[PDB]
Design a protein around this motif. Structure first.
Motif, PDB file in Angstrom:
ATOM      1  N   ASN A 115      20.837 -59.039   4.382  1.00 55.27           N
ATOM      2  CA  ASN A 115      21.653 -57.864   4.142  1.00 55.27           C
ATOM      3  C   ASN A 115      23.027 -58.284   3.661  1.00 55.27           C
ATOM      4  O   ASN A 115      23.627 -59.201   4.216  1.00 55.27           O
ATOM      5  CB  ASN A 115      21.784 -57.014   5.404  1.00 55.27           C
TER       6      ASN A 115
ATOM      7  N   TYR B 213      26.899 -56.668   2.234  1.00 45.34           N
ATOM      8  CA  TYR B 213      27.730 -55.474   2.201  1.00 45.34           C
ATOM      9  C   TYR B 213      29.006 -55.717   1.410  1.00 45.34           C
ATOM     10  O   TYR B 213      29.486 -56.842   1.325  1.00 45.34           O
ATOM     11  CB  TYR B 213      28.106 -55.044   3.613  1.00 45.34           C
TER      12      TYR B 213
ATOM     13  N   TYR C 286      32.755 -54.158   1.475  1.00 48.08           N
ATOM     14  CA  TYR C 286      33.802 -53.371   2.099  1.00 48.08           C
ATOM     15  C   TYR C 286      35.106 -53.443   1.314  1.00 48.08           C
ATOM     16  O   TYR C 286      35.326 -54.333   0.495  1.00 48.08           O
ATOM     17  CB  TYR C 286      34.043 -53.855   3.522  1.00 48.08           C
TER      18      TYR C 286
ATOM     19  N   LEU D 287      32.851 -48.941   3.906  1.00 51.64           N
ATOM     20  CA  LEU D 287      31.693 -49.512   3.227  1.00 51.64           C
ATOM     21  C   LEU D 287      31.486 -48.854   1.875  1.00 51.64           C
ATOM     22  O   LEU D 287      31.519 -47.628   1.764  1.00 51.64           O
ATOM     23  CB  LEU D 287      30.439 -49.343   4.077  1.00 51.64           C
TER      24      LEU D 287
ATOM     25  N   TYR E 140      25.845 -51.674  -0.179  1.00 50.00           N
ATOM     26  CA  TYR E 140      25.216 -52.708   0.608  1.00 50.00           C
ATOM     27  C   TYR E 140      23.804 -52.869   0.080  1.00 50.00           C
ATOM     28  O   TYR E 140      23.408 -52.216  -0.880  1.00 50.00           O
ATOM     29  CB  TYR E 140      25.304 -52.385   2.100  1.00 50.00           C
TER      30      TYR E 140
ATOM     31  N   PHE F 259      36.244 -57.117   0.961  1.00 52.60           N
ATOM     32  CA  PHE F 259      35.545 -58.146   1.706  1.00 52.60           C
ATOM     33  C   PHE F 259      34.052 -57.953   1.541  1.00 52.60           C
ATOM     34  O   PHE F 259      33.573 -56.833   1.538  1.00 52.60           O
ATOM     35  CB  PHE F 259      35.910 -58.119   3.181  1.00 52.60           C
TER      36      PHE F 259
ATOM     37  N   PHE G  84      18.288 -59.447   9.219  1.00 52.21           N
ATOM     38  CA  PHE G  84      17.616 -58.228   9.621  1.00 52.21           C
ATOM     39  C   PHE G  84      17.879 -57.949  11.095  1.00 52.21           C
ATOM     40  O   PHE G  84      17.643 -58.803  11.945  1.00 52.21           O
ATOM     41  CB  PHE G  84      16.116 -58.359   9.364  1.00 52.21           C
ATOM     42  N   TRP G  85      18.348 -56.742  11.397  1.00 47.84           N
ATOM     43  CA  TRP G  85      18.585 -56.278  12.768  1.00 47.84           C
ATOM     44  C   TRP G  85      19.610 -57.136  13.489  1.00 47.84           C
ATOM     45  O   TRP G  85      19.603 -57.215  14.718  1.00 47.84           O
ATOM     46  CB  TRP G  85      17.304 -56.218  13.619  1.00 47.84           C
ATOM     47  N   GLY G  86      20.508 -57.768  12.741  1.00 45.69           N
ATOM     48  CA  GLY G  86      21.400 -58.736  13.333  1.00 45.69           C
ATOM     49  C   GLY G  86      22.551 -58.089  14.067  1.00 45.69           C
ATOM     50  O   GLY G  86      23.033 -57.035  13.693  1.00 45.69           O
ATOM     51  N   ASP G  87      23.003 -58.753  15.123  1.00 46.48           N
ATOM     52  CA  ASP G  87      24.134 -58.275  15.905  1.00 46.48           C
ATOM     53  C   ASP G  87      25.486 -58.654  15.318  1.00 46.48           C
ATOM     54  O   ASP G  87      26.510 -58.237  15.863  1.00 46.48           O
ATOM     55  CB  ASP G  87      24.046 -58.797  17.340  1.00 46.48           C
ATOM     56  N   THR G  88      25.524 -59.410  14.223  1.00 48.55           N
ATOM     57  CA  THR G  88      26.763 -59.960  13.703  1.00 48.55           C
ATOM     58  C   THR G  88      26.861 -59.750  12.203  1.00 48.55           C
ATOM     59  O   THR G  88      25.884 -59.932  11.477  1.00 48.55           O
ATOM     60  CB  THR G  88      26.859 -61.452  14.006  1.00 48.55           C
ATOM     61  N   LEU G  89      28.043 -59.364  11.749  1.00 55.61           N
ATOM     62  CA  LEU G  89      28.408 -59.406  10.344  1.00 55.61           C
ATOM     63  C   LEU G  89      29.257 -60.639  10.080  1.00 55.61           C
ATOM     64  O   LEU G  89      30.071 -61.029  10.917  1.00 55.61           O
ATOM     65  CB  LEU G  89      29.195 -58.164   9.948  1.00 55.61           C
TER      66      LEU G  89
ATOM     67  N   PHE H 141      31.893 -62.198   7.374  1.00 57.60           N
ATOM     68  CA  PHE H 141      32.726 -61.742   6.276  1.00 57.60           C
ATOM     69  C   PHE H 141      33.212 -62.900   5.420  1.00 57.60           C
ATOM     70  O   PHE H 141      33.097 -64.073   5.770  1.00 57.60           O
ATOM     71  CB  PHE H 141      33.914 -60.950   6.803  1.00 57.60           C
ATOM     72  N   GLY H 142      33.749 -62.546   4.262  1.00 54.03           N
ATOM     73  CA  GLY H 142      34.379 -63.507   3.390  1.00 54.03           C
ATOM     74  C   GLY H 142      35.879 -63.519   3.575  1.00 54.03           C
ATOM     75  O   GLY H 142      36.448 -62.778   4.368  1.00 54.03           O
TER      76      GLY H 142
ATOM     77  N   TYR I 267      25.827 -50.004  20.684  1.00 49.02           N
ATOM     78  CA  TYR I 267      26.279 -51.372  20.504  1.00 49.02           C
ATOM     79  C   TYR I 267      27.684 -51.331  19.934  1.00 49.02           C
ATOM     80  O   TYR I 267      27.938 -50.641  18.944  1.00 49.02           O
ATOM     81  CB  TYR I 267      25.339 -52.133  19.593  1.00 49.02           C
TER      82      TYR I 267
ATOM     83  N   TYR J  14      35.708 -56.945  16.239  1.00 53.28           N
ATOM     84  CA  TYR J  14      35.973 -57.930  15.202  1.00 53.28           C
ATOM     85  C   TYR J  14      37.459 -58.290  15.154  1.00 53.28           C
ATOM     86  O   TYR J  14      38.313 -57.404  15.154  1.00 53.28           O
ATOM     87  CB  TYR J  14      35.517 -57.386  13.844  1.00 53.28           C
TER      88      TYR J  14
ATOM     89  N   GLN K 291      15.073 -50.603   5.398  1.00 55.78           N
ATOM     90  CA  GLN K 291      15.203 -51.937   5.972  1.00 55.78           C
ATOM     91  C   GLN K 291      13.881 -52.451   6.509  1.00 55.78           C
ATOM     92  O   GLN K 291      13.626 -53.657   6.447  1.00 55.78           O
ATOM     93  CB  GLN K 291      16.261 -51.981   7.073  1.00 55.78           C
TER      94      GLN K 291
END
Lengths: 239, 193, 196, 174
Positions: free
Chosen positions: A29, A31, A33, A43, A46, A88, A94-99, A101-102, C31, C35, D62
């Motif tokens: 995935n 995105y 921003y 957003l 994406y 950014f 998939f289904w991840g808890d974390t983004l 960023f750049g 959730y 950040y 997804q």
């Protein structure tokens, strides 16, 4: 990791800007921003995999393109002044808890390239009253009259870059807060010991990285074209 | 409002090839006994399965040993899939299904016609539970009666046809008797010979 | 559905516990990742809580979750100055499988380093088209408010370089085209402030 | 598995070549809705359910991305073993009792579909009038069944199935 390109960009109303993002996390995935004050992160587009892209919450004016699992590209076909911002990119599983960023892309879209100026820098030497009264000595760097607010400051002490004792403004202020084309100023402070400043062998240098026009851009005025450049002011230790 | 939640397909690390996945929730007595089984299928052969009675992924063919072992390690995956019995099955039942699927009730259309044999056609109802009985002059006739199976129409309506072998002599009254949960009182449609 | 954070910016002295507040209006959110964005960088995951918990502890950072009031708080204890950054409260309802994430507007946490012996003073620096006044070493009961005049620029919220090790302070700088005695006439200056 | 009701939630079907995907929900054998992957829209079987519940169509997109991914990996794992075709069977019947003159729907029910790619069409002349097709439904053996509908004004039809596991296209008469 996630990197963006370009890191800074100047562009005129009505041209085609292409931010672009590369990711090497084997994420799926990706995105796009943008960050503006009063609005947080928002957003734009994406994507779930190569070939697909989805309309975010602010898809007006931007197209996106995910030709590869690793690339994902924001594209502005008729840039507007309302599209100036800090963009950014992100990725995630998939289904991840974390983004993830750049580092960011500052984009200025200008009605005209006439208001694009580089910074004028100056170093101000510590006071004697501060020295004798604290056995500490504080130099102050001012960068003034630049546009747009894409600058990065650094203090250099005897040929190397220095971090201890530095505090830099976090964001530039506006020289003429009334105008819309106001130019900006940054300030910074370097504090050293007094015995270190009173050594006339030590030199102190304020370096200001300014990001502006490019080797491929064109300039329709006599004043030197505000390219991307380094601007310094210097000072030596006194008695 | 009230929302449907789908399971999350675990990801893995001319000629045609087919992938298919599903989450089967199995409710008995409402939410009293829920069972949750997710299936991954390549080319019609099921290869990996979760079963809430097992409590962990297992592989139905060899081609699925990778994904079952893997998905059993990373507890962000396994605890989540274990929890989809609540966040998908129990949730969808106690939520949207109650406002939609479990509340649909459509009353049948009963009409008799003589093709001798009389046909009782019972159409366009939901749910599937229906009884259709023939009377002759007020006497249940289970001899010579033949119905279709439950015919599913695919638009959330069913249909059943009940044919009776008979012979009419003027004055006789045949009635089609239709019991259903949509119905206050059973429907009766009569046909005088 | 929106995420709202308070306050819009927080200033704290090295040692205090900062408290960043967040609330959401969609009860389906489950959730809540926070950040951290350092200046000039892109945000990174700091700490996340799920709705089946009311407190997630990790180092000096702690999320407190309250389901009935729909409220979160991030508590930073022993706030270092390198904690200075913008902090975003984010929320998703994971059930909808969307992938999007809802972001608060951020609160800007600017932590001040402690000063061993406060010695507030306003010094004049060697000019080379303006002249610079420097307010420094003030204690925690002064607020440098901006100038009541154009053509007099005052800055006072500088992020100390992250790698600083040996001379951390937090001074205010004013310049113009103007003397340092009146330069901060528009702020709340401590009584014992030393003007040479 | 014995049960009273059966929710069959998030059926993701993907196949290549063609990039052919489908995401549906089901309850007690009946289609709740599918997600339209082009217009990216939850399309409900019964509009009246679209008014009493919802589903965010992005969970579908997804899950279809996940499933395309898994199709690539497993394609490679088995060394590009291809799918074997099947002979589908139709069955034509009317929706309501056939009354010459009154308007009715005519239902073609095809089963033993695999892979899910079929052409289903309909006087010995082709018709595209009141044709509604359904989504692919799931069978306990992981084949599919599809229902096509034809609104007609009865008066004194063949369902034409064109598939791969059919040597010649088959007609069921009316």
């Amino acid at each position: 990791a996630v990197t963006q390109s370009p890191r800074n960009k100047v562009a005129v109303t009505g041209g085609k800007v292409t931010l672009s993002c590369n990711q090497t996390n084997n994420h799926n995935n990706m995105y796009w921003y943008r960050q503006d004050t009063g609005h947080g992160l928002r957003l734009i587009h994406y994507s779930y995999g190569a070939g697909s892209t989805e309309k975010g919450d602010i898809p007006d004016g931007y197209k996106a393109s995910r030709p590869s699992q690793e690339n994902f590209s924001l594209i502005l076909e008729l840039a507007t002044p309302s599209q100036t911002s800090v963009y950014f990119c992100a990725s995630g599983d998939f289904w991840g808890d974390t983004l993830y960023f750049g580092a960011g892309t500052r984009l200025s879209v200008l009605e005209d390239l006439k208001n694009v100026f580089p910074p004028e820098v100056a170093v101000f030497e510590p006071s004697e009253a501060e020295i004798s009264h604290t056995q500490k000595a504080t130099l102050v760097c001012l960068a003034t009259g630049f546009y747009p607010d894409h600058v990065e400051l650094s203090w250099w002490v005897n040929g190397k870059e220095v971090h201890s004792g530095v505090c830099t403004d976090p964001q530039p202020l506006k020289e003429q807060p009334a105008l819309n084309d106001s130019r900006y100023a940054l300030s910074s402070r370097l504090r050293v010991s007094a015995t270190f400043w009173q050594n006339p062998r030590n030199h102190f240098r304020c370096q200001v990285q300014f990001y502006g026009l490019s080797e491929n851009d064109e300039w329709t005025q006599d004043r030197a074209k505000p390219v991307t450049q380094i601007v310094s002011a210097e000072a030596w230790g006194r008695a | 409002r009230v929302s449907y939640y789908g399971p999350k397909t675990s990801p893995v690390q001319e000629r045609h090839f087919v992938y298919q996945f599903m989450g089967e929730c199995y409710f008995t007595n409402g939410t009293q006994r829920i069972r949750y089984v997710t299936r991954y299928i390549y080319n019609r052969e099921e290869y990996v399965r979760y079963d809430s009675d097992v409590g962990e992924h297992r592989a139905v063919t060899e081609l699925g040993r990778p994904d079952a072992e893997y998905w059993n390690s990373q507890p962000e995956i396994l605890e989540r899939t274990r929890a989809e019995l609540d966040t998908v099955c129990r949730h969808n039942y106690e939520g949207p299904e109650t406002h939609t699927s479990l509340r649909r009730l459509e009353q049948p259309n009963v009409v008799i016609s003589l093709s001798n044999t009389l046909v009782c056609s019972v159409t366009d109802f939901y749910p599937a539970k229906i009884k259709v009985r023939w009377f002759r002059n007020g006497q249940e006739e289970t001899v010579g009666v033949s119905s279709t199976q439950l015919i599913r129409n695919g638009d959330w309506t069913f249909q059943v046809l009940v044919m009776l072998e008979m012979t009419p002599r003027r004055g006789e009254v045949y009635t089609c008797h239709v019991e259903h949960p949509s119905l206050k009182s059973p429907i009766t449609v009569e046909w005088r010979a | 559905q929106q995420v709202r954070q308070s306050p819009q910016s927080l200033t704290v002295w090295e040692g205090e516990t900062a408290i960043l507040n967040c609330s959401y209006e969609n009860s389906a959110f489950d959730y809540f990742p926070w950040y951290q964005q350092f200046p000039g960088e892109g945000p990174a995951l700091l700490i996340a809580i799920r709705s089946v918990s009311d407190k997630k502890e990790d180092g000096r950072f702690t999320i407190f979750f309250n389901k009935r009031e729909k409220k979160l708080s991030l508590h930073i204890t022993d706030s270092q100055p390198g904690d200075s950054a913008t902090y975003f409260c984010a929320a998703s309802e994971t059930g909808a499988n969307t992938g999007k994430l809802t972001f608060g507007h951020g609160t800007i946490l600017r932590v001040h380093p402690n000063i061993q012996n406060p010695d507030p003073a306003v010094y004049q620096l060697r000019d080379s088209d303006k002249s610079v006044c420097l307010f420094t070493d003030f204690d925690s009961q002064t607020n440098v408010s901006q100038s009541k005049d154009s053509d007099v620029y005052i800055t006072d919220k500088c992020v100390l370089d992250m790698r600083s090790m040996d001379f951390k302070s937090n001074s205010a700088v004013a310049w113009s085209n103007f003397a340092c005695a009146n330069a901060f006439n528009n702020s709340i200056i401590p009584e014992d402030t030393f003007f040479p | 598995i014995e049960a009273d009701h059966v929710g069959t939630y998030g059926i993701s079907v993907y196949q290549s070549p063609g990039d052919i995907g489908q995401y549906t929900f089901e309850f007690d054998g009946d289609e709740l809705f599918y997600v339209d992957l082009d217009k990216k829209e939850t399309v409900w079987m019964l509009p009246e359910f679209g008014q009493l519940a919802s589903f965010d169509p992005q969970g579908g997109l997804q899950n279809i991305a996940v499933v395309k991914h898994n199709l690539g990996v497993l394609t490679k794992r088995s060394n590009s073993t291809p799918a074997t075709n099947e002979a589908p069977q139709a069955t034509v019947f009317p929706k309501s009792p056939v009354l010459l003159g009154q308007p009715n729907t005519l239902i073609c029910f095809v089963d033993n579909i695999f892979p899910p790619v079929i052409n289903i069409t309909w006087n010995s002349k082709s018709v595209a009038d009141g044709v509604y097709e359904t989504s692919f439904f799931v069978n306990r053996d992981y084949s599919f069944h599809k229902l096509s509908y034809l609104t007609f004004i009865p008066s004194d039809y063949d369902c034409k199935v064109e598939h791969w596991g059919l040597e010649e296209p088959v007609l069921k008469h009316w």
